[PDB]
Amino acid sequence: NVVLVGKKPVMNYVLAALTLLNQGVSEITIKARGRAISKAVDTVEIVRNRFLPDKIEVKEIRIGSQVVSRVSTIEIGIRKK
């Protein structure tokens, strides 16, 4: 129950997240690395503020690194209220 945010338009990942939520998945994690990290935050904010206002909480946010080169990563856990 993970949406990996990559290079595609942000609405791709917004719709992927809503699809899971509408399937009865109440907790999903949005993940990204490198420059896509800002698009992962966009994805969550669009889902939280524009689609499901007052029904999505941000449960936790983790940042880290991975070797490839070091690249940064983010993981954002969201939950239905």
Q: Are 29 and 59 in contact (CB under 8 A)?
A: no
Beta-carbon-side half-sphere exposure of residue 35 (alpha carbons within 13 Å): 3
**Binding to its own copies (CB under 8 A): which residues in 38-77?**
38, 41-42, 44-46, 49-50, 58, 61-65, 70, 72-74, 76
Which H or E element spans position 39?
helix 36-46
Cα three-residue angle 63-67-72, rounded to 5 degrees: 25
Total residues binding its own copies (CB under 8 A): 23
Out of K ion, its own copies, none, which partner does residue 15 contact, by CB within 5 to 8 A per kind? none
**Binding to its own copies (CB under 8 A): which residues in 21-40?**
34-38
Contact set with its own copies (CB under 8 A): 34-38, 41-42, 44-46, 49-50, 58, 61-65, 70, 72-74, 76
